[PDB]
Amino acid sequence: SDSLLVRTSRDGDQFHYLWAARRALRLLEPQSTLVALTIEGASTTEMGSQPVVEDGEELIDIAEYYGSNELATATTVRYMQLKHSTMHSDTPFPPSGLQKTIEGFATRYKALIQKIPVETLRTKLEFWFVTNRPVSSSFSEAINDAANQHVTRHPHDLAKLEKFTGLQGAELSIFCQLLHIEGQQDDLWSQRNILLRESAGYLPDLDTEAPLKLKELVNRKALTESAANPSITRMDVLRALGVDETDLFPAPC
Amino acid sequence: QRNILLRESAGYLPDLDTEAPLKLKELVNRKALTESAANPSITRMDVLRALGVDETDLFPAPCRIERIENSVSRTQEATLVQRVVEAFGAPVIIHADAGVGKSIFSTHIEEHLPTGSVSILYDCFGLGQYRNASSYRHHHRTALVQMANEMASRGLCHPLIPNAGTGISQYMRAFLHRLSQSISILRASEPLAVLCIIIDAADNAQMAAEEIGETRSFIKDLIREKLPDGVCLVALCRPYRRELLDPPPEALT
Amino acid sequence: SDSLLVRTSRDGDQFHYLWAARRALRLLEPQSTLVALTIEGASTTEMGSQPVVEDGEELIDIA
Amino acid sequence: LGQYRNASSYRHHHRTALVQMANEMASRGLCHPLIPNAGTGISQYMRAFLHRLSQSISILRASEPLAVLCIIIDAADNAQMAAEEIGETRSFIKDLIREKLPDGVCLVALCRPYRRELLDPPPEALT
Amino acid sequence: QRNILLRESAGYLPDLDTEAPLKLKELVNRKALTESAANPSITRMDVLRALGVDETDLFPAPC
Ligand SMILES: Nc1ncnc2c1ncn2[C@@H]1O[C@H](COP(=O)(O)OP(=O)(O)OP(=O)(O)O)[C@@H](O)[C@H]1O
Ligand SMILES: [Mg+2]
């Protein structure tokens, strides 16, 4: 049927919002260095006052910034891309799938390398691929051996990786040093309740409205009305739960 | 659209609420995934379990007064009922001691009203189960909900469905608001219809309240409240327990 | 930009769900004749036990 | 073990005792599990408990027609002493002893002779 | 009667208590047709995570 292919489009957004909402909790840690999440777009303050780099921007599902909301002085920055295939959860992906993501990652990499030198960016920058399904092991081995400068056992997968990246030698190696693969995630039916279990640790009791409210916050960052500012900060999470800083320190010494 | 839903949903509840517009939207959204493709329907039970109540919460205390077939000719009652309607603007209390026929008369009174009239009958005694924790009958949040949904079932006004944490003044205002709608409906089709409220066994409720440590059963507040024009209120008790429900000086005995 | 045309796709679903949720309240009326809402597809019991008509089905937002 | 007067270890509220007994029958396969909710009143707990008594005895007597279900409350007076020591008046047993149970279940309590009137039996009770 | 439990429309506590009967059936059905995983068995930890509770929520006061 046709309606099946329309319904299967919504489950991907549900997976995306739940998985981002589980990440958003880390802003509450009092002795941790994370500072910002941006949903469907990089930070508008990424180059400070200077205009933003638009290359490879549309693969950005989630971006995470540590230390500063600005690539020139942040300690670490992550850009992440997600995939939720519904009906084939046990079946490994081929490299012809990861091609379409690797292309855009290299496109963003080139424009970032032009403005800031490699010896800085190689300490900061990561690209992640996150998916429900397992991923081809030999392709990962080729990625590893490229990143470590060893003769791989699978030259066809390395040739495919070269075709996808358009790079060879150590310039390929550096790029493969920034590429992270994370398969075999818990599916939607599990993700829907893991969030409840993790959110129950900050509260004094079990709760059943907080997993709704964090998801609603993440969803309302993904509309057109919030396009001027896609950021999430600690104050946003606290006013989503409905408290302010005085409730955490009601009676000072 | 995001706030019109709040305004329309606030009419069925006794107070303003800010979680119901989320929950109905979540219900509709979860009907639009693949997991519910076997059944895309929405029914009344789905909406009620989305709000978190069931049919027992709309009818928490049904009537139980025994009707009888034999009825000896007994001349006073036809005068005593017109004595009520011709002495409007004040609460009326009937009293007589044990086994004289108050509860039977409460079933007969309805036949003598002017045409077009409607009467609501409430039972505070049950069958001696009113003193048990699973069968209390004396709170506002039971009797007022009972009477509101009995009028709504007959087609006079909107339903009133309970919400946790709601105080006594909100239930009083929600009840008094719907009395006016019902009396407008009655006095459209006929000029002289009345709406009559009968509280049988009014003295048991205050005994049950005082036994568990409370002091204000619902009839102890309702008797001094002022009802809209065209509404009658009658209470029946034994003669020596009459001071528990403490009538105002303007009352009729 | 391209991302504008992706973001504008979500607002339509938000409008759809809010507008359907306003319709769903009418099921609570004690003296009204409405019996069912079906979201993105007609009722599977539309022809009783007989198989369902599939023509023109995908324009059905709400039934 | 003498902990029942410390704030983190109370045992005399409905939402502790009835949840314990319901899940102890449910773990054995006789009824659905009962899990608590914040903001629920005591009458809802009473009705939800009686429902699962009705489930359990119907499971049992379909295989042995003269079987019974026994519910035992040890140290019944201590629950009322702990309640009155902090300003309440109705521990769970003081309500449960006057409630009407389904057929095929029996209810037994144990106490010291000089403390018996704390839990105030009705005239039908057997001693 | 000796073997099958069924939901009535009444008696259950609101919210999380209502859907445990459905989620046990869902867990069993999910496990039977996810034989491609490392193992299809059910153990206590998966039951507790299916219900959403912790053991101390079921047993707040042991004997
Ligand atoms: N009109 C009647 N015709 C026949 N029998 C009647 C009539 N009214 C009362 N009785 C008899 O009197 C009995 C007592 O009636 P009823 O229960 O109404 O009394 P009551 O005054 O409400 O009692 P109580 O004060 O004890 O609550 C009835 O059960 C019935 O046997
Ligand atoms: Mg009587």
State which amino acid sits at residue B250.
E
Neighbouring CB atoms inside 10 A of D87's CB total 6
Separation CA B175–CA B178 (nearest Å): 5
Determine the Cα angle at A61 with ends A57 and A66, to 5°: 90
Between A90, A193, A206, which is nearest E49 by CB? Answer: A193
Structure tokens at B161: 């469905």
Tell me the CA–centroid distance for residue B121 and ligand 2, in Å: 13
- State the nearest Cα–Cα gap between A177 and chain C, in angstroms: 29
Tell me the CA–centroid distance for residue A171 and ligand 2, in Å: 95
Contact A192/E49 with Cβ under 8 angstroms? no
Separation CA B14–CA B164 (nearest Å): 10
Mutation choice for ligand 1 from B103, B108, B200, B203, CB with most ligand atoms inside 8 A: B103
Separation CA B20–CA B14 (nearest Å): 13
Among A5, A10, A18, A88, which would you mutate to test the B interface (most chain B Cβ atoms within 10 Å of its Cβ)? A10
State which amino acid sits at residue C9.
S
Separation CA B176–CA B228 (nearest Å): 8
Verify whether ligand 1 is closer than 6 Å to residue B128 (CB atom): no
Radius of gyration of chain D (CA): 15
Contacts of B177 (CB under 8 A, 6+ apart): none
What sign results for the dihedral spanned by CA atoms B176, B182, B186, B188?
positive
Of the candidates D95, D98, D105, the one whose C-alpha atom is nearest the C-alpha of residue D124 is D98
Ligand 1 atom at minimal distance to the Cα of residue B101? 18
Instruction: Mark whether C and D touch (3+ CB pairs within 8 Å).
Output: no
**Mind giving me the DSSP string for B24-61?**
HHHHHHHTTSSTTTT--EE-HHHHHHHHT--HHHHSSS
Measured torsion, CA atoms of residues A54, A60, A66, A71, in degrees rounded to the nearest 10: -10
Bridge partners, residue D69, by sequence? D105
Separation CA C44–CA C50 (nearest Å): 10
Backbone angles phi and psi of B137, in degrees to 5: -130, 10
Q: Which DSSP symbol is given to A59? A: G
Q: Which DSSP symbol is given to C57? A: G
Q: Quick one: angle between helices E44-51 and A188-199, nearest 10?
A: 80
Residues in E closer than 8 angstroms to B49, CB to CB, are 14, 18
Alpha helix positions (H), chain A: 3-24, 95-115, 118-121, 137-148, 155-165, 170-176, 188-199, 210-220, 234-241, 245-248
B133 and D43 within 8 Å at the Cβ level: the answer is yes
CB burial of A220-242 (b: ≥16 within 10 Å; e: otherwise) equals ebbeeeebeebbbeeeebbebbe
- Strand, coil or helix: what is B151? helix
Contact A55/A249 with Cβ under 8 angstroms? no
Q: Which DSSP symbol is given to B243? A: G
Alpha carbon A160 to chain centroid, angstroms: 24
Q: How was this structure determined?
A: cryo-EM
B155 and C40 within 8 Å at the Cβ level: the answer is no
State which amino acid sits at residue D27.
S
Ligand 1 atom at minimal distance to the Cα of residue B74? 1
Contact B145/B162 with Cβ under 8 angstroms? yes
Contacts of A253 (CB under 8 A, 6+ apart): none
Contact A167/A106 with Cβ under 8 angstroms? yes
Ligand 1 atom at minimal distance to the Cα of residue B201? 27
Determine the Cα angle at D52 with ends B62 and E16, to 5°: 90
Radius of gyration of chain A (CA): 20
- State the nearest Cα–Cα gap between B133 and chain E, in angstroms: 15
What CA–CA distances, in Å, run from A232 to A127, A135, A215, C14, D3?
20, 31, 12, 21, 46
Confirm or reject contact between C35 and chain A (CB < 8 A).
no
Length of chain C in terms of residues written: 63
Confirm or reject contact between C59 and chain B (CB < 8 A).
no
Bridge partners, residue A93, by sequence? A135
Q: Which DSSP symbol is given to C46? A: T
Measured torsion, CA atoms of residues D7, D13, D18, D19, in degrees rounded to the nearest 10: -40
Instruction: Mark whether E and D touch (3+ CB pairs within 8 Å).
Output: yes
Separation CA E13–CA A58 (nearest Å): 46
End-to-end CA distance of chain C: 36
Between B22, B26, B37, which is nearest A7 by CB? Answer: B37
Structure tokens at B103: 């509860």
Residue owning the nearest CA to atom 15 of ligand 1: B101
Structure tokens at B76: 């006073």
- Strand, coil or helix: what is A3? helix
Instruction: Based on DSSP, count helices (H) and strands (E) in chain D, helices before strands.
Output: 4, 2
Separation CA A236–CA A221 (nearest Å): 11
Separation CA B147–CA B62 (nearest Å): 10
Bridge partners, residue C39, by sequence? C62
Of the candidates B156, B49, B51, B28, the one whose C-alpha atom is nearest the C-alpha of residue C23 is B28
DSSP element (H, E) containing E22: helix E20-32
Strand order across the beta sheet in which B231-237 lies: B92-95, B231-237, B195-200, B118-123
Contact D11/D18 with Cβ under 8 angstroms? no
Contacts of B88 (CB under 8 A, 6+ apart): B232
Pairing of strands A34-39, A231-232: antiparallel
Of the candidates A84, A107, A65, the one whose C-alpha atom is nearest the C-alpha of residue A19 is A84
Contacting chains of B (3 CB pairs or more, <8 Å) are A, C, D, E
Contact B5/C22 with Cβ under 8 angstroms? yes
Separation CA C7–CA A221 (nearest Å): 10
Separation CA D115–CA D94 (nearest Å): 13
Query: Which of left, alpha, beta for A43 (phi over 0: left; psi -120 to 50: alpha)?
Result: beta
Structure tokens at A73: 């002085």
Of the candidates A183, A161, A171, A149, the one whose C-alpha atom is nearest the C-alpha of residue A102 is A161
Looking up tokens 């000896």 gives: B72
Contact B147/B122 with Cβ under 8 angstroms? yes
Separation CA D88–CA D83 (nearest Å): 5
Separation CA C27–CA C45 (nearest Å): 19
State which amino acid sits at residue A26.
R
What CA–CA distances, in Å, run from A95 to A61, A99, A134, A138, D36?
21, 6, 12, 10, 49
Of the candidates A106, A243, A83, the one whose C-alpha atom is nearest the C-alpha of residue A163 is A106
CA closest to C38 among chain B residues? B41
Alpha carbon B126 to chain centroid, angstroms: 15
Confirm or reject contact between C30 and chain B (CB < 8 A).
yes
Separation CA C60–CA B213 (nearest Å): 58
Alpha carbon A17 to chain centroid, angstroms: 12
Contact B180/B86 with Cβ under 8 angstroms? no
CB burial of A106-135 (b: ≥16 within 10 Å; e: otherwise) equals bebbeebbeeeeeeebeebbebbbbbbbeb
* Ligand with smallest separation from the Cα of B66: 1
Verify whether ligand 1 is closer than 6 Å to residue B104 (CB atom): yes
What CA–CA distances, in Å, run from B28 to A12, B8, B33, B73, C38?
17, 17, 10, 60, 10
A206 and E57 within 8 Å at the Cβ level: the answer is yes
Query: What Å resolution does this PDB entry report?
Result: 3.4
Contacts of B4 (CB under 8 A, 6+ apart): C22
Separation CA A77–CA A68 (nearest Å): 9
Structure tokens at A150: 């060893």
What sign results for the dihedral spanned by CA atoms B236, B239, B242, B248?
positive
Contacts of A132 (CB under 8 A, 6+ apart): A15, A83, A84, A85, A89, A183, A184, A185, A187
Residues in B closer than 8 angstroms to C37, CB to CB, are 41-42
* Ligand with smallest separation from the Cα of B101: 1
Residues in E closer than 8 angstroms to B53, CB to CB, are 14
Of the candidates A126, A108, A130, A137, the one whose C-alpha atom is nearest the C-alpha of residue A177 is A126
State which amino acid sits at residue A58.
E
Give the number of C-alpha atoms closer than 13 A to the C-alpha of residue B161, restricted to the C-beta side. Answer: 22
Structure tokens at B233: 């209120």
Residue owning the nearest CA to atom 30 of ligand 1: B101
Contacts of A57 (CB under 8 A, 6+ apart): A41, A42, A108, C3
Separation CA D13–CA D16 (nearest Å): 6
Mutation choice for ligand 1 from B69, B75, B94, B104, CB with most ligand atoms inside 8 A: B104
Separation CA B237–CA B249 (nearest Å): 17
Separation CA A69–CA A44 (nearest Å): 9
Looking up tokens 């930009």 gives: C1
Separation CA E8–CA E2 (nearest Å): 17
Contact A181/A140 with Cβ under 8 angstroms? yes
CA closest to B163 among chain D residues? D39
What sign results for the dihedral spanned by CA atoms A245, A209, A219, A63?
positive
Verify whether ligand 1 is closer than 6 Å to residue B45 (CB atom): no
